[PDB]
Design a protein around this ligand. Structure first.
Ligand code: ZN
Ligand code: ZN
Ligand code: ZN
Lengths: 77, 271, 77, 89
């Protein structure tokens, strides 16, 4: 193909690249510690909405407190 | 007696029973704390806020008792109840995603209360803290319009409207979704005020002139809006657009009633 | 779990039934009112299930059959 | 406790910002007309000049990008090809 849905597949691949780069980058920052609230085992992935289709309604349910601190670190970081 | 209230809250947290009985007991404890005064009332309410945000306490108990807490607070005067407003706003962060109605209510109360003490600086910053973008609590288009309008008006009275430009925008972005005509009129007045402030005197005069020929706007406000149109037209850049507005403003008989009637009369008649 | 959770719609039941309804002899979430349909006032318990001695035991109730059913097939068409 | 969480593999999604306060092609505002139109009236017919949104989530006037798209086609804020995803705001 040319400049078509293969481009949609291009963005799909970029997200995997960003997920692992942020994975090791977050590994370095959880190594620094000092102000880490939820300092437990995390493997967080980063994707983009431009190429992944609608998975679901993306609900907004609650999160357990220990994961909440873990999620708060990454979102702040 | 704030320590006794805190001890009762701690004991009630570990108690097991029906939701209605626990909610009633917490409400009674809250009423007893409200009946206090001075630092004792402040610390008792602080422990009440800390208990509600606590993980173990039911969200139903958390959301409603905080709501019922926020209902009794406007009765307490413009005093020590505002350091706890910053305290309560700071505390809500684990359940800030679970509920944000109380956060919006506190910020709305705090913004108006800061507005009372001639403080458009801090009232703006507090009201910006409202996460209107979230959408899971779908703030009715009027409510988002009302909040964004209030931020712009607060910034206009403080004159740092680099952000109020971005705030009259997000008011405008959801503006073409709302229903309330009076809110729309209140928006267009504020939007015309924003145009008048920045450089858009010619555009504000156009907006003021459009708002001048309305009916629900008070006759005094209609005269004031037209007076704003006349002043903006005189102050705008002298050109083809401004000349046409001067011709348009030479038609209103309530322009004649104004003191600047002579000013544009010499103006448009080429003096 | 519906009043103190801010839980989404029926998708909750599919997640909830993954531990109780349609379960083999590896149940990690048992209930007293044994029935197929879901009730309101039913209590949840836990079972040891020594048969599932698997240390990192997983409950893979999801992805039972990736088959692209018709309702998504028609809408994407 | 009886059950404790050890590992978590949540996926974080993100979206770009737009800074809707002024477009970059004409520098007037996101709304309130463009350099090719100036005033509201004078043969506008309900102002046939709205805001256009691209796939990259940037926003400009419809006419401004139209003059941009005739010469170049590369969305001067990124290197996306600037698809057409919306009309108006
Ligand atoms: Zn522009
Ligand atoms: Zn235009
Ligand atoms: Zn762009």
């Amino acid at each position: 193909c040319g400049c078509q849905f293969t481009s949609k597949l291009e963005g799909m691949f970029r997200d995997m690249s960003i997920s692992n780069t942020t994975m090791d980058e977050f590994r370095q920052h959880l190594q620094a510690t000092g102000v880490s609230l939820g300092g437990v085992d995390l493997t967080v992935r980063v994707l983009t909405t431009g190429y992944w289709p609608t998975q679901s309604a993306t609900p907004k349910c609650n999160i357990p407190p220990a994961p909440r601190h873990a999620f708060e670190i990454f979102r702040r970081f | 007696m704030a320590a006794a209230v805190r001890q009762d809250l701690a004991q009630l947290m570990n108690s097991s029973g029906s939701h209605k009985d626990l909610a009633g007991k917490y409400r009674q404890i809250l009423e007893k704390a409200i009946q206090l005064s001075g630092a004792e009332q402040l610390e008792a309410l602080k422990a009440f806020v800390e208990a509600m945000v606590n993980e173990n306490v039911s969200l139903v108990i958390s959301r409603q008792l905080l709501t019922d807490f926020c209902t009794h607070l406007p009765n307490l005067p413009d005093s020590t109840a505002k350091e706890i407003y910053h305290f309560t706003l700071e505390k809500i962060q684990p359940r800030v995603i679970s509920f944000e109605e109380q956060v919006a209510s506190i910020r709305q109360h705090l913004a108006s209360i800061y507005e009372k003490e001639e403080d458009w600086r801090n009232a703006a910053q507090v009201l910006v803290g409202i996460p209107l973008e979230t959408g899971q609590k779908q703030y009715n288009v009027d409510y988002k319009l009302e909040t964004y309008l209030k931020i712009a008006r607060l910034y206009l009275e403080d004159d740092d409207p680099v952000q109020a430009e971005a705030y009259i925008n997000r008011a405008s972005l959801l503006q073409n979704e709302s229903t309330n005509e009076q809110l729309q009129i209140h928006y267009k007045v504020c939007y015309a005020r924003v145009l008048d402030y920045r450089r858009k005197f010619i555009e504000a005069a156009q907006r003021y002139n459009e708002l001048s020929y309305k009916t629900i706007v008070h006759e005094s406000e209609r005269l004031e809006a037209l007076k704003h149109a006349l002043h903006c037209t005189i102050l705008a850049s002298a050109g083809q657009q401004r000349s046409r507005m001067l011709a348009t403003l030479f038609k209103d008989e309530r322009c004649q009633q104004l003191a600047a009637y002579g000013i544009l009369e010499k103006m448009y008649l080429d003096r | 779990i519906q009043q103190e959770t801010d839980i989404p719609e029926r998708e909750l039941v599919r997640a909830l039934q993954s531990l109780a309804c349609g379960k083999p002899t590896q149940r990690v979430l048992t209930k007293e009112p044994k029935s197929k349909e879901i009730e309101n006032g039913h209590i949840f318990t836990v079972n040891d299930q020594f048969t599932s001695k698997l240390h990192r035991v997983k409950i893979q109730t999801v992805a039972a059959k990736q088959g692209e059913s018709d309702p998504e097939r028609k809408e994407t068409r | 406790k009886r059950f404790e969480v050890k590992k978590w593999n949540a996926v974080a999604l993100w979206a770009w910002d737009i800074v809707v306060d002024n477009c970059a092609i004409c520098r007037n505002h996101i709304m309130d007309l463009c350099i090719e139109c100036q005033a509201n009236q004078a043969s506008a017919t309900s102002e046939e000049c709205t805001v256009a949104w691209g796939v990259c989530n940037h926003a400009f006037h419809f006419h401004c990008i139209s003059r941009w798209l005739k010469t170049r086609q590369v969305c001067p804020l990124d290197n996306r090809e600037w698809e057409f995803q919306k009309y108006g705001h």
